[PDB]
Amino acid sequence: TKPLPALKLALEYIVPAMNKHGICVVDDFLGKETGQQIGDEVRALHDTGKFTDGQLVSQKSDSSKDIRGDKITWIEGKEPGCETIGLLMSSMDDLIRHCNGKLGSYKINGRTKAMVACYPGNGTGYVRHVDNPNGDGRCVTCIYYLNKDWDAKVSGGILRIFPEGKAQFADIEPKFDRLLFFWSDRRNPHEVQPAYATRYAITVWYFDADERAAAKVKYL
Ligand SMILES: O=C(O)CNC(=O)C(=O)O
Ligand SMILES: O=C(O)CNC(=O)C(=O)O
Ligand SMILES: [Mn+2]
């Protein structure tokens, strides 16, 4: 058993999947050893108190209705004790680089830092939402899941995606060493169903050059 080269995974699987469905799941992305190291680094972030409630990020005010029960932190990838998260981010970047110019009409020219997120069980989730509804430049959502032996039947935590205007929907279990791509805009409203166990994931959003520039123009 051998890893597929990034170029081959990108052009033979990710590009066609994305252009046909707007969603692409890649399992066994990095392997057990690396995935476990990433899990250790995320758990260290959690135990040392680096997470902030995601509700604080998404709410309009402290009176707003509940949106999300996760806790998050932003990782650049070069921080001490986050080197393996940095390797994950470089691996994502390599796939996108081999895709660029073939994912719809997008020209991807940047990305966010990594959003490390924890749903601490207790029935927490994330109401249905669109990641980028107002044209802030993000065109692709990329999520890496880190949860060993996750049993959705008992622990829940399914990501459910409802592709706009299609007669289908997708259920993504937050499985260990799974990589997920999907269009960030209104085409993919999605929700995280209540999680009854600790659920970790790492997300990066990629930027489309033209839309991000236009967003900067409205910005100014
Ligand atoms: O963690 C997941 O499966 C999905 N998370 C989100 O939709 C988000 O944080 O915006
Ligand atoms: O089928 C889809 O589009 C997404 N879900 C999966 O890849 C799975 O549950 O294995
Ligand atoms: Mn989302």
Author numbering: 185 to 404
Give sentences from the paper.
The ferrous iron and 2-oxoglutarate (2OG)-dependent HIF prolyl hydroxylases (PHDs/EGLNs) catalyse trans-4-prolyl hydroxylations on HIFα subunits, thus promoting their binding to the von Hippel–Lindau protein (VHL), a targeting component of a ubiquitin E3 ligase, and signalling for HIFα degradation under normoxic conditions. The PHD-catalysed hydroxylations of HIF-1α/HIF-2α in higher animals occur in amino- and carboxy-terminal oxygen-dependent degradation domains (NODD and CODD). The three human PHDs exhibit different NODD/CODD selectivities, with PHD3 being substantially more selective for CODD than PHD1/2 (refs 16). Biophysical analyses employing crystallography and NMR reveal that the molecular basis of PHD isoform and variant selectivity involves enzyme–substrate interactions involving β2/β3 loop residues (that bind the LXXLAP motif) and helices α3 and α4, regions which display sequence variations between the PHD isoforms.
Comparison of the ODD complex structures and those without substrate reveals clear differences in NODD/CODD binding, especially in β2/β3 loop and C-terminal regions.
